[PDB]
Amino acid sequence: MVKAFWSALQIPELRQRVLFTLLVLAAYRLGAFIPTPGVDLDKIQEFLRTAQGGVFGIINLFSGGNFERFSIFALGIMPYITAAIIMQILVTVVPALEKLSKEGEEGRRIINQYTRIGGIALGAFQGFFLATAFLGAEGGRFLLPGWSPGPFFWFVVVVTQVAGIALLLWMAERITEYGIGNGTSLIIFAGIVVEWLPQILRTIGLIRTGEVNLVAFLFFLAFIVLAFAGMAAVQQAERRIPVQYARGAAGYGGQATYIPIKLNAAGVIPIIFAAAILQIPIFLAAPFQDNPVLQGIANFFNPTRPSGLFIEVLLVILFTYVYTAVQFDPKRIAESLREYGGFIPGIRPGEPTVKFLEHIVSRLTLWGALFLGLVTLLPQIIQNLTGIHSIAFSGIGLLIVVGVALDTLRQVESQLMLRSY
Amino acid sequence: MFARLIRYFQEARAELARVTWPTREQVVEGTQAILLFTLAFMVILGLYDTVFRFLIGLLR
Amino acid sequence: MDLLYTLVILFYLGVAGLLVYLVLVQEPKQGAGDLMGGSADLFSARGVTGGLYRLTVILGVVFAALALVIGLWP
Hints:
Radius of gyration of chain B: 25 Å
Oligomer: heterotrimer
Keywords (chain A): Cell inner membrane, Cell membrane, Membrane, Protein transport, Translocation, Transmembrane, Transmembrane helix, Transport
Structural class of chain C: mainly alpha
Subcellular location (chain A): Cell inner membrane
Pfam families (chain A): SecY
Number of domains of chain C: 1
Membrane topology (chain A): Multi-pass membrane protein
Shape of chain B: elongated
Order of helices and strands of chain C: HH
Shape of chain C: elongated
Number of strands of chain B: 0
Main location (chain A): membrane
Largest interface: A-C, 52 and 38 residues
């Protein structure tokens, strides 16, 4: 929530977690320099300059800058995120897995296993697909001299990317295990915030050459600060429903006399889901570079262009609202109230309580979702007005940064509170 | 705004008026916390990819 | 040059596949590791977990250096 930064670094117990996290991130960023055998990187970096390669930006941002360097983790954890989304879909469709999920955690572990396997298999599939379409349909426009666009190159790429996404997934799990915050979350966060410093540096370097107006950059940075303060102030906002109970032997309370309900859960999962969703058509249309129509429908979902930004905003709002609504279960709070003798002044403990809870939550979460949609919309507009242009400073990027930071800090502080009392 | 069901947006405003917003100190501390976190990881990762690039640069 | 290259490639495939097998066998306790962040009050290390850890790290580094080898073959 707030602070808990110095005390977390003083305590050796959390210091080990932090240093371990930094170590794994170091190994990640080091492994980000090991290129896929048989791939010309300079021509890719040169391809990402044109309008035909600009659409890759949204995909490049969530790769951790691995795409342009085509590392072993070329696609990042995004195949695993896509695998998780598809896993949600398949879970919804066929109840053969939901029965196992209803058989306890013993089925949940199965769901997890199949999710990960789906991730690795997606690594293989997407690797082979990119290698077949994007890398050698031109062909050989991105291939190193001495490398043929045959079965051998495809084999090498597949073998590389499979073990790549495998090792990366394992790393994420180890971060989730022996480190602060969520693994995949901190990894995506890292992959985004890595590019931040060179952007600022090159911008400052562009200021003195009379290329970029200093006022534009200053106003831009100020807008970043305002975004920070804004999301920080919204995430901590809450509605407090007073509950009085219970004079007699039923109580007495004795406990918290109010139920807090917030606009944000908060969760970094929604906008990541929406990110992958927005990336799928772009990732499926971009490899077929020579085809104009597919390039058109790919530019239709570009987060920079009005259309793609619109779709992105809708996705952010929708996913935020849905996730926030799902995470908060009225049933458990209500039965807790009934069992503890909790009585909210005005109604009777039971179904009408959850009905009223839904009645407030539904009217409440809307403004939060719309707010996150606003944070999704505004930065691209500012960039379109100001001189600065960077997808690393886009709406969804700021959403991810703020989200992950807040999540990690909140969790750590929560653990401190738990060890306290 | 359209027929025939009435705008429940008023409720969405009403239940927004009964919302307790965080204090000044909470906003300041939150902002400074996010800033500290982000700045820290940005500097550390920056140094990371920098020295990694400069180390790989020796392999030619 | 024909035998050598293909041998190194065989090692690439082998190390890759073995790494995949390892990370597939290794499931994070308190699953899944995508939803939550995990407890930070107390944690225990297992011999299977630790051993497969020490192994998969080595296989990881090996896969990296080997990727460099394949990536820099004249």
